[PDB]
Amino acid sequence: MLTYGAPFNFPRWIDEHAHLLKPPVGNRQVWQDSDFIVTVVGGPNHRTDYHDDPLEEFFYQLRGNAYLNLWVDGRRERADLKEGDIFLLPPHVRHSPQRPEAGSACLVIERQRPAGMLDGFEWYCDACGHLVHRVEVQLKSIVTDLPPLFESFYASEDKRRCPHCGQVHPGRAA
Amino acid sequence: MLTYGAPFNFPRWIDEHAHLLKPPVGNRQVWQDSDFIVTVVGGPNHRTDYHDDPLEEFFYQLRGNAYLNLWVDGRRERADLKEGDIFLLPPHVRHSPQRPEAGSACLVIERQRPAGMLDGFEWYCDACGHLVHRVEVQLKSIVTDLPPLFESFYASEDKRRCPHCGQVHPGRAA
Ligand SMILES: Nc1c(O)cccc1C(=O)O
Ligand SMILES: Nc1c(O)cccc1C(=O)O
Ligand SMILES: [Fe+2]
Numbered sequence: 001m002l003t004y005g006a007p008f009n010f011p012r013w014i015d016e017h018a019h020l021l022k023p024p025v026g027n028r029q030v031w032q033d034s035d036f037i038v039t040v041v042g043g044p045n046h047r048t049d050y051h052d053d054p055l056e057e058f059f060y061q062l063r064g065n066a067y068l069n070l071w072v073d074g075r076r077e078r079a080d081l082k083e084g085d086i087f088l089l090p091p092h093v094r095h096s097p098q099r100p101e102a103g104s105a106c107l108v109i110e111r112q113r114p115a116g117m118l119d120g121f122e123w124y125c126d127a128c129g130h131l132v133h134r135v136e137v138q139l140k141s142i143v144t145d146l147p148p149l150f151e152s153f154y155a156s157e158d159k160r161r162c163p164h165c166g167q168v169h170p171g172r173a174a
Numbered sequence: 175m176l177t178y179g180a181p182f183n184f185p186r187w188i189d190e191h192a193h194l195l196k197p198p199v200g201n202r203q204v205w206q207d208s209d210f211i212v213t214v215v216g217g218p219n220h221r222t223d224y225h226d227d228p229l230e231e232f233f234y235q236l237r238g239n240a241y242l243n244l245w246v247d248g249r250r251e252r253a254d255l256k257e258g259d260i261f262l263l264p265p266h267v268r269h270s271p272q273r274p275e276a277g278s279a280c281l282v283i284e285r286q287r288p289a290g291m292l293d294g295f296e297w298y299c300d301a302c303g304h305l306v307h308r309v310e311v312q313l314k315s316i317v318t319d320l321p322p323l324f325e326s327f328y329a330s331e332d333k334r335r336c337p338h339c340g341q342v343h344p345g346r347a348a
């Protein structure tokens with residue numbers, strides 16, 4: 001059986017789900033219960049966390065522009081996702097997607113993580129660059145598992161305190 | 175490190191590789207040695223085999239139209255990939271992609287198969303629908319492993335002989 005339904009027009013689907021590809025929801029998964037996790041991500045959404053994904057992530061910036069803040073070779077770097085760009089991120093490259101534009105839309109494809117393969121979410125100190133805090137999770141929902149984790153970091157001056165310089169990370173807005 | 179390079183413009187990439195998204199090559203893999211197998215498939219290409227993929231396959235028909243001949247619930251069915259359509263195929267649904275249009279381009283995303291998880295390629299009898307022949311392979315190249323297998327089926331009246339009605343399958347062109 002075609003468990004995931006028939007083919008359907010992607011631009012029209014993005015149009016119809018416009019009102020969720022904006023705050024407060026921002027992403028929307030296309031099919032449920034599949035191995036390939038297929039999502040569209042809109043904007044604006046800025047965020048302060050770096051994701052450590054144990055598997056690859058594929059990006060295709062269909063509409064508008066975005067960029068990824070990265071740690072590469074130990075240094076902060078920015079990789080732009082200009083409209084029309086595709087990109088494949090190797091496992092464990094730390095990335096913080098920045099999506100400043102309303103009406104933008106990025107196809108993002110990931111895989112279900114097998115039991116025991118954990119995702120990391122991390123924050124770094126703006127002053128000294130040291131790691132401030134890391135939570136690891138067995139990720140079951142690329143949409144619903146992230147926020148509670150981000151909320152417990154914003155709520156805690158303890159978790160936000162840099163262990164190297166003692167600066168308290170700003171928390172929600174950089 | 176960004177093992178797979180920086181983001182890059184996908185339409186321009188498809189344009190530049192136009193001359194391989196036509197006979198005799200027809201598909202082109204975007205990145206090498208990755209877990210996600212990311213390919214663009216052009217046309218025209220018709221084929222007679224049904225693929226039994228042990229993992230999911232994602233389709234996004236960027237340019238032009240195509241269709242997939244399927245076996246679903248035991249019956250031959252056609253699922254159209256109209257320009258703009260996306261589609262997710264569950265594991266083991268038999269599919270024979272038909273790509274009649276020159277200049278067409280379909281993004282197809284699959285996963286590397288772990289050792290021991292085999293792909294099947296099958297042919298069915300036009301007269302009685304019975305399975306005529308099946309080869310299983312440990313697939314390492316979504317481009318180079320298929321043709322030798324198709325060639326050994328076209329070359330063999332034995333492999334093309336339906337075991338139920340005795341009709342010899344046409345082989346290369348339906
Ligand atoms: N790359 C992302 C991820 O793994 C989860 C949620 C959103 C994104 C994104 O690019 O915005
Ligand atoms: N779906 C395909 C596959 O698994 C291998 C090669 C080509 C295709 C296609 O859609 O044409
Ligand atoms: Fe991510």
Ligand SMILES: [Fe+2]
Nearest residue numbers: 125128162165
């Ligand atoms: Fe610090």
Ligand SMILES: [Fe+2]
Nearest residue numbers: 225227231269
């Ligand atoms: Fe296939």
Ligand SMILES: [Fe+2]
Nearest residue numbers: 299302336339
């Ligand atoms: Fe037959």
